[PDB]
């Protein structure tokens, strides 16, 4: 039922490694019976029920049963479960390729879209036919058979290379050893929460709760150099070999399909349409931010010159890779009086979580309720149920996995677990999402204290959660966040603006000790500190965007050389020789291949909606919040990205709001 919750969450997380392998073989045999039945039908006999609806019913049944198998590799603490889950991801990723390359299925769906009356079906069914046929053409199903087996052969190799690329990073346990003197200027709440060795030295891992606090506050330059070296050489040996195979294979499968490069292949399925416009968007944005980067580099270089003179170090005259985070933090403390170590005392995890939910309970008109005794994959994971405030309709659920552990996903992402689409029996599926982040842990007898940049990630990742649950379509491929890759970052990056409002920050803040709020002067300086270090921060994002476009344009190109090239050209900070950032670039194998520009591309749309609709009528206005929910979040992938923007903005988007929010034109 749409107003109940019992039984709508069929995901179980207590599967043994043997049960996963058994459930995988059963899922393949059951799903193949559906595809084989459609393939064994007459071309003049296919109808909407035995062909389109039959495939739509198994796609919802498959992606849900698949999620129970490919997800434990990212969260489970048992390594055998993570290993068995990976062998199911490899097994099923090659199975999806085998089912997509079926010529008999493609011959029958083109017959429906060319012979049947398209007026007797829903508009999402017509979009289902066009998108299903277009994906068949993007797999070479309209090409000779000897080149289909060649494309099917290479895509199965690309499937295993992308899984191994992230499996190496997820299982990386590389760590360094330092002494108390080598960890200068670091607070005692961080030093005392580290593993001590036999010779009284400390152990520091290469994950976010350990790497960033060191690179932002350690005064010892040699300690920051070793951490930067070890962090950018994670899986350097094995992931470089994968890039030596994956990138040539990506350009080879694109040339067989008629595309010049792999970048041109994936850009057709995005809102940017062409790669010539992407490189034009990045190069023109890099010019407006070039003078800003020069001012920040000169100020940072002066800070390094004075500190080396005051401490007695050897000033080399350049900004190294390990010096960037340490002196950008000093720019934040001197020009805006923002001490991140002091501000985190006002952002405990419980108060931030409560304030975050209450902010969107009133904005989007929803109701959140934690479920006691939750069946989860780890005891530190909480479950919440989302209802519609006005109608009591149970929209969906979502998990909260906020603290890092062994074998956990070491970045910050949101995984769609169940799509909010229709079932064969006419009912609606309960959408399930999962928020996975690596926030700070309770130390020094205090609750988890979050830095302000950790609250943004909490607000960003919750954007994908609301987009997953509020999206309600008819087919599983259009449900959730399954939209244009350069557009999925619109709902998530837009919620970050609520972390820079003076009134909303008071609803998120409460000192962990005396319960007092943040001082008025500090709150004003915090909002004014939005554009601090905005030059080098965006230039680094522009570099990663240009590297993604370059590595998918040129054929025989050294991945490490091209990253170091754009660093000295755009960012101005040279890449450390011997490192390899693309070897740790998990986005190259996580669906963002050639599409990393979407992080800056989607920001142009979010700022244009926040300034033209929200900032005018009020960022807490339920009228604009409901319009945003129904026109952007609810359609999901059932509509084009620009169509949903045109329905909300009542016009075409522009960079006017995006530029003035960055201090530019």
């Amino acid at each position: 039922s749409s107003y109940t919750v019992a039984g709508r969450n069929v995901l179980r997380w207590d599967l043994s490694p043997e049960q996963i392998k058994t459930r995988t073989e059963e899922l393949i045999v059951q799903t193949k019976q559906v595809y084989d039945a459609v393939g064994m039908l007459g071309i003049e006999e296919v109808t909407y029920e035995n062909c389109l609806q039959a495939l739509a019913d198994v796609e919802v049944k498959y992606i849900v049963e698949r999620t129970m198998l490919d997800f434990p590799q990212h969260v489970s603490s048992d390594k055998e479960v993570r290993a068995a889950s990976t062998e199911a991801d490899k097994r099923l990723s090659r199975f999806d390729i085998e089912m997509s390359m079926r010529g008999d299925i493609f011959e029958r769906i083109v017959h429906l879209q060319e012979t049947c009356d398209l007026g007797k079906i829903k508009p999402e069914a017509r979009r289902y036919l066009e998108k299903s046929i277009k994906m068949g053409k993007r797999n070479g199903l309209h090409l000779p058979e000897q080149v289909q087996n060649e494309i099917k052969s290479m895509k199965k190799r690309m499937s295993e290379l992308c899984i191994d690329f992230n499996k190496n990073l997820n299982e990386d346990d590389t760590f360094l050893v330092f002494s108390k003197a080598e960890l200068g200027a670091l607070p005692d709440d961080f030093i005392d929460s580290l593993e001590k060795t036999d010779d009284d030295k400390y152990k520091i891992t290469l994950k976010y709760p350990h790497y960033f606090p060191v690179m932002k506050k350690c005064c010892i330059p040699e300690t920051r150099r070793r951490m930067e070296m070890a962090f950018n050489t994670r899986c350097k040996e094995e992931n470089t070999i994968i890039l030596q195979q994956l990138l040539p294979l990506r350009t080879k499968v694109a040339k067989l399909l008629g595309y010049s490069t792999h970048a041109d292949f994936v850009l057709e399925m995005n809102t940017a349409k062409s790669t010539s416009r992407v490189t034009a968007f990045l190069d023109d944005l890099s010019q407006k931010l070039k003078p800003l980067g020069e001012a920040e580099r000169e100020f940072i270089l002066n800070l390094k010159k004075k500190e080396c003179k005051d401490r007695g170090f050897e000033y080399d005259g350049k900004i190294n890779a390990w010096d960037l985070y340490y002196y950008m933090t000093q720019t934040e403390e001197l020009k805006y009086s923002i001490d991140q170590e002091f501000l985190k005392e006002y952002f405990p995890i419980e108060v931030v979580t409560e304030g975050l939910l209450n902010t969107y309970q009133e904005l989007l008109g929803l109701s959140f309720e934690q479920m006691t005794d939750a069946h989860v994959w780890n005891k530190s994971v909480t479950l919440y149920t989302v209802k519609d405030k006005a109608t009591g309709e149970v929209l969906g659920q979502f998990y909260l996995d906020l603290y890092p552990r062994e074998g956990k996903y070491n970045h910050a992402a949101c995984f769609g677990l169940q799509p909010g689409c229709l079932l064969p029996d006419g009912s609606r599926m309960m959408a399930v999402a999962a928020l996975v982040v690596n926030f700070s842990q309770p130390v020094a007898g205090r609750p988890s204290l979050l830095r302000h940049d950790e609250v943004r990630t909490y607000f960003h990742e919750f954007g994908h959660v609301m987009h997953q649950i509020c999206a309600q379509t008819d087919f599983a491929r259009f449900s959730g966040t399954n939209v244009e890759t350069d557009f999925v970052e619109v709902p998530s990056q837009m919620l970050e603006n609520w972390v820079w409002d003076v009134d909303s920050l008071r609803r998120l803040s409460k000192h962990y000790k005396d319960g007092s709020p943040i001082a008025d002067d500090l709150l004003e300086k915090l909002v004014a500190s939005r554009l601090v270090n905005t030059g080098l921060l965006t230039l680094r994002q522009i570099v990663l965007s240009k590297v993604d476009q370059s590595l998918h344009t040129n054929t025989s190109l050294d991945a490490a050389s091209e990253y170091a090239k754009y660093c000295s050209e755009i960012l101005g900070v040279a890449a450390t020789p011997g490192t390899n950032m693309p070897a740790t670039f998990g986005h190259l194998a996580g669906g963002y291949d050639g599409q990393y520009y979407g992080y800056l591309w989607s920001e142009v749309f979010s700022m244009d909606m926040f300034y033209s609709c929200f900032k005018k009528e009020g960022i807490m206005n339920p009228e604009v919040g409901m319009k945003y929910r129904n026109l952007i979040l609810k359609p999901g992938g059932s509509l084009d990205g620009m169509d949903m923007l045109h329905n909300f903005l009542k016009r075409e988007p522009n960079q006017k709001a995006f530029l003035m929010s960055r201090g530019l034109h």
């Binding site: 976010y208 960033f212 910050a412 940049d453 990630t457 960003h460 990742e461 998530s492 990056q493 994002q541 990663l544 670039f585 986005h587 990393y596 992080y599």
Partner: peptide, 4 residues
């Protein structure tokens, strides 16, 4: 989100 993006690589920090």
């Amino acid at each position: 989100i993006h690589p920090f």
